[PDB]
């Protein structure tokens, strides 16, 4: 969905719909070519992806979602009846999955030795 | 047992359905592991090896991408045909004149003769689109993405009727040493998946290609994706009770050992319908660690598309059904008595890329600044792999043997694989002179 590439007009009067990228540019962005004064945006963005991928994430953590409890008491309580360590490992395989995902690509990654040097 | 029944009572098996070059009969052998085999991977740097790079792109970035393309191939364009210089696209002009851009449609839908538009390059018109009026032209054949140069005329700057369209030109084949004219005759299979019928997981048709490898003992055997279907009812409904990577490794484990007595070198190339692997194109080599050390020397991953030189031999390989997307979207002047195919082939091969279409299918994810360096043609391939959807063919265009073999299965029937011999001739003669003699199309 997000490689498919789809713009929208930023104007509410025009909301222009297409997949090809002009390669006339404006300031902001592409410049529109049904209205010729707009930018096109993007229907689906990098950071819109980016944050579903850390929701997947994030419903199979619970690694986290323990240490997130107001009272150590409850926790251990709970730990104890539901949180096997059986269980806790199949949580652990659901939460690689969108891990292998987010490894690498996306650039949730920061490069400091370009962003100094 | 009912899966696979229309499949396992097939009697067309062993069917030659096509030939081309010099006939040959039914004994179709190679020399097994005998005798020199050189496999290389060419090109730009090569075929992708490391898992990628990224997953979000930056619009100004494809911007360049685009904007280098056409630039490109409009000097070098300018350079074969010597023309004088470019004029800019909203420049009125009552003289005729010479325009460089690309073809594009101006809506969503199909492109048609009434909705072609030219959108130029950024030095000379900085991205500026104007339509174009074919009703002049006699003779034309244009898909969207397409870097062209038009003759025409432009008297108000803002419609441009076309009138004469400059055929492309192909890049210069590769040029032999002299240790490739000391090859011998070599045999090489080709097939392409899906390697199961469209209601089972019992995986026959493979079993049926591993026999015939073990009978043949060809030197190379290609094999192109999917082992695993994305589009597979089971896969797509989450019925399978095994991981998707244990049940490739299956399959993986299940061809190498089956081959094994063979001696016949393995290739893997990788699909977009894999589940398992990156959907995203170009694609990085499939990844197998339990390999013996016997194993290392008959299995390759490469990339797709690949550029392969078997015994200083060209292979272009690339599993997109390129053919099927391109024939959907192609204008022409003439369809009465005229090759849809060969057209296609020829426009693959003057446009330089492994998908010269823009923007591409609606389901098809491409990286721009990794198809900038892996998915360029070095040169013009000697024998081009391009399996597809579409009917069986080999045609002979523009020197290049074009192959397409088909699907191993089609629907709940079987399919057909291809064979091939290679062997280079003298050095001296006419010109071109093709390393592959014959070529046979078979069923499976
Ligand atoms: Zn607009």
């Known amino acids: ?117 | 047992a009912t899966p696979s029944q229309k499949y396992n009572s097939r009697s067309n098996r062993g069917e030659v359905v096509t030939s081309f070059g010099l006939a040959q009969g039914v004994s179709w052998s190679g020399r097994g592991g005998a005798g020199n085999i050189s496999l290389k991977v060419l090109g730009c740097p090569e075929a992708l090896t490391g898992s990628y790079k990224s997953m979000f792109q930056k619009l100004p970035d494809i911007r360049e991408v685009l904007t280098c393309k056409i630039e490109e191939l409009g000097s070098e364009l300018k350079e074969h045909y010597k023309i004088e210089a470019f004029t800019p696209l909203l420049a009125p002009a009552q003289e005729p004149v010479t325009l460089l851009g690309q073809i594009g449609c101006d809506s969503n839908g199909k492109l048609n003769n009434k909705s072609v538009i030219l959108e130029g390059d950024r030095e000379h018109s900085s991205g500026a689109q104007i339509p174009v009026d074919l009703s002049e032209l006699k003779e034309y054949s244009l898909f969207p993405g397409q870097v062209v140069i038009m003759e025409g005329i432009n008297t108000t700057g803002r419609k441009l009727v076309a009138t004469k369209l400059y055929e492309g030109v192909p890049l210069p084949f590769y040029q032999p040493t002299e240790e490739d004219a000391d090859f011998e005759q070599s045999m090489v299979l080709v097939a392409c998946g899906p390697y199961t019928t469209s209601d089972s997981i019992t995986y026959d048709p493979l079993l049926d290609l591993i026999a015939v490898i073990n009978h043949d003992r060809p030197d190379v055997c290609i094999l192109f994706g999917p082992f695993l279907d994305a589009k597979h009812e089971q896969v797509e409904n989450c019925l399978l009770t095994s991981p998707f990577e244990d049940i490739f490794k299956q399959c993986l484990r299940t061809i190498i050992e089956g081959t094994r007595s063979s001696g016949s070198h393995l290739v893997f190339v990788p699909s977009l319908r894999d589940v398992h692997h990156e959907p995203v194109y170009p694609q990085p080599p499939f990844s197998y660690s339990d390999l013996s050390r016997e194993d290392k020397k008959q299995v390759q991953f490469v990339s797709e598309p690949c550029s392969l030189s078997i015994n200083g031999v060209i292979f272009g390989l690339t599993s997109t059904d390129l053919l099927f997307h391109l024939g959907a979207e192609e204008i022409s002047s003439s369809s009465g008595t005229s090759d849809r195919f060969s057209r296609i082939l020829k426009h693959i091969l003057t446009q330089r890329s492994y998908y010269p279409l823009y923007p591409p299918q609606e389901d098809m994810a491409i990286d721009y600044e990794s198809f900038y360096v892996y998915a360029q043609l070095p040169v013009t391939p000697d024998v081009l792999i391009i399996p597809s959807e579409l009917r069986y063919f080999v045609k002979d265009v523009l020197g290049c043997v074009c192959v397409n073999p088909g699907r191993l299965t089609k629907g709940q029937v079987g399919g057909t694989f291809a064979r091939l011999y290679l062997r280079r001739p003298a050095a001296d003669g006419a010109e071109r002179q093709s390393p592959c003699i014959a070529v046979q199309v078979v069923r499976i």
């Open chain 1, 1 to 117: 969905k997000y490689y498919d590439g789809w713009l929208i007009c930023e104007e509410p009067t025009c909301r222009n719909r297409t997949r090809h990228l002009p390669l006339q540019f404006s300031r902001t962005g592409p410049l529109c070519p049904a209205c010729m004064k707009a930018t096109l945006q993007p229907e689906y963005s990098d950071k819109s992806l980016y944050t579903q991928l850390c929701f997947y994430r994030y419903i199979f953590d619970a690694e986290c979602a323990l240490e997130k409890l107001t009272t150590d008491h409850e926790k251990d309580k709970l730990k104890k009846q539901f949180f096997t360590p059986k269980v806790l490992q199949d949580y652990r395989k659901l939460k690689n999955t969108a891990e292998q995902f987010l490894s690498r690509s996306g650039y949730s990654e920061v490069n400091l030795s370009k962003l100094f040097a």
